[PDB]
Amino acid sequence: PQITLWQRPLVTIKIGGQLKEALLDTGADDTVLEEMSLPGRWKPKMIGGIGGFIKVRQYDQILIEICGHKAIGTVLVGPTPVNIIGRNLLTQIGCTLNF
Amino acid sequence: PQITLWQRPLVTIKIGGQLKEALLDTGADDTVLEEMSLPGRWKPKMIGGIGGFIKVRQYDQILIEICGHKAIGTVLVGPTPVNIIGRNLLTQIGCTLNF
Numbered sequence A, B: 001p002q003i004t005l006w007q008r009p010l011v012t013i014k015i016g017g018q019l020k021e022a023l024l025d026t027g028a029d030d031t032v033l034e035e036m037s038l039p040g041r042w043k044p045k046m047i048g049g050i051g052g053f054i055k056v057r058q059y060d061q062i063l064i065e066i067c068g069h070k071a072i073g074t075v076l077v078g079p080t081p082v083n084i085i086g087r088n089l090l091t092q093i094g095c096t097l098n099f
């Protein structure tokens, strides 16, 4: 998939038995998904963005299928407005910018 | 060019006769630069990102060079922690997301 940027690059992901839509964000180092039910252990972490800082729970090694591709990594669950797939998973599915 | 996501996608821009580095960001609908000296009339505006909302100054018809590519668009200037090039200019230098 070559995705053009006239529309938000939004993709289907499958995480925790759940179907979600997530924004692909090259400006996000990490993956932060809207508040949700996930099995396991997690650690308190704080991340920053344009508005300021948020408190998120960090889950390591969670399986995500992103546009039909699989990846395992740290997933952060928290008060984000949209689900964001960031560069930690995006390098895992071979994703590059091109111009 | 083809940019991998192992490191932040940072680029050199010349905006208003000044050289700066900015992040290529697909989760950014707009372009927002740290406070700088830009000539012109601007409208007040507010954007939201991850830990909230910021108040920016909107400048329309700003000329900006990204890697030698010239582009003319709207640029929001305000307290962003990093210079961000969003999809309003990314579609102008023809940039895509491939995976």
Ligand SMILES: *[C]C(*)(*)(*)([C@@](*)(*)*)C(*)(*)([C](*)C(*)(*)(O*)C(*)(*)([N@](*)(*)C(*)(*)(*)(=O(*)*)[C@](*)(*)*)C(*)(*)(*)C1(*)(*)[C](*)[C](*)[C][C](*)[C]1*)C(*)(*)(*)(=O(*)*)[N@@](*)(*)[C@@](*)([C](*)[C]C([N])=O)C(=O)[N][C]([C][C][C][N]C([N])=[N])C([N])=O
Residues within 6 Å of the ligand: A023, A025, A027, A028, A029, A030, A031, A032, A046, A047, A048, A049, A050, A081, A082, A084, A086, B023, B025, B026, B027, B028, B029, B030, B048, B049, B050, B081, B082, B084
């Ligand atoms: C880079 C930038 C800042 C980004 C941004 C994004 O893109 C957003 N957008 C806006 O804002 C426009 C996203 C979303 C979209 C939709 C709506 C909501 C929002 C960011 O912010 N990023 C962040 C996230 C990721 C993670 N967390 O990982 C980040 O990256 N953060 C970080 C910090 C940075 C800074 N750096 C230095 N300064 N060094 C953390 N760590 O957290």
